[PDB]
Design a protein around this nucleic acid. Structure first.
Length: 315
RNA sequence: GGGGGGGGG
């Protein structure tokens, strides 16, 4: 069953869901019984593929088949419903798991807190944070990161920083994601100097900046009118073997264009093409906006044609 | 062998 499970999971994660569903059928034919991991894996692949209804059929199928859902089953479904905007049903599954004696774990609480924060229901999220504490389910680096992000984005950056305090004090070591989240939140709140000090500090703590780190500061510097430093960090991260990705390029294209520096931006569009980093819908959209605003509408219309011709769907 | 957190228009 483990062979089929691993392949199924590999196929789903590569977007080859129909092959996955094929193998699921093969293993039943061949007398290799799906277990809870088989179903969990297919349910997670389907949800992530936009195919929540078929995922909900398989959940029904495993109960029909005597294969009891486990904490990972419920976590996977809760996260899928939450992301698809179905938070109320996710909250009802969380009630249902407790009623059935399937103990929620730190991932359960984390998933829910994230879904609640992103839905605007930060006070509820903070209640659950309280609740997991009273229930003896210890917050981990991910709980803290989730809350720090939710707070900052709700414009509650002071709490967010208190919480970074609490975290360090209870021996939860901030990781690259913590630093990345706080850097973005500070930058977006116009506290760019503190964000650049945190950049220095994570390097001192041996917590290596990653692409997300550089992307975040690059954007933060661009929008603050510090394009030269932003272009400096671009060169730097390359010199340090941290590969610019599509986001890095789009960010820099957009900052060059709003700064009046469109031929540089069109240069990078070329450059990323050369370097096999494929422009995505955000790339095209940024370029089209920049060209239009510079009075180069004929060229923006031509790019719109190009993105469609190349299968990058306009949104 | 399966589930949760950070960056761009």
């Amino acid at each position: 069953v483990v062979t089929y499970n691993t392949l199924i999971d590999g196929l789903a994660k590569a977007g080859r869901l129909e092959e996955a569903l094929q193998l699921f059928q093969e293993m039943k034919e061949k007398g290799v019984k799906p277990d809870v991991v088989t179903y969990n894996t297919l349910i997670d692949g389907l949800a992530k593929a936009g195919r929540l209804e078929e995922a909900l059929q398989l959940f029904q199928e495993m109960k029909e088949k005597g294969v009891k859902p486990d904490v990972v089953t419920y976590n996977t479904l809760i996260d899928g419903l939450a992301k698809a905007g179905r938070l109320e049903e996710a909250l009802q599954l969380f009630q249902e798991m407790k009623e059935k004696g399937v103990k929620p774990d730190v991932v359960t609480y984390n998933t829910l807190i994230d879904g609640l924060a992103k839905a605007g229901r930060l006070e509820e999220a903070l209640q659950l944070f309280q609740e997991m504490k009273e229930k003896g389910v210890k917050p981990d680096v991910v709980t803290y990161n989730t809350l720090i992000d939710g707070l900052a984005k709700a414009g509650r950056l002071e709490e967010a920083l208190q919480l970074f305090e609490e975290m360090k004090e209870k021996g939860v070591k901030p990781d690259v994601v913590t630093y990345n989240t706080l850097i973005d939140g500070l930058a977006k709140a116009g506290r760019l100097e503190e964000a650049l000090q945190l950049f220095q500090e994570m390097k001192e703590k041996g917590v290596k900046p990653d692409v997300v780190t550089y992307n975040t500061l690059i954007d933060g510097l661009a929008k603050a009118g510090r394009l030269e430093e932003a272009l400096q960090l671009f060169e730097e991260m390359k010199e340090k073997g941290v590969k610019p990705d599509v986001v890095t390029y789009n960010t820099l294209i957009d900052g060059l264009a709003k700064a009046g520096r469109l031929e540089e931006a069109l240069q990078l569009f070329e450059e990323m093409k050369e370097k096999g980093v494929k422009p995505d819908v955000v790339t095209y959209n940024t370029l089209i906006d920049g060209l239009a605003k510079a009075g180069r509408l004929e060229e923006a219309l031509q790019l719109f044609q190009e993105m469609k011709e190349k299968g990058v769907k306009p949104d």
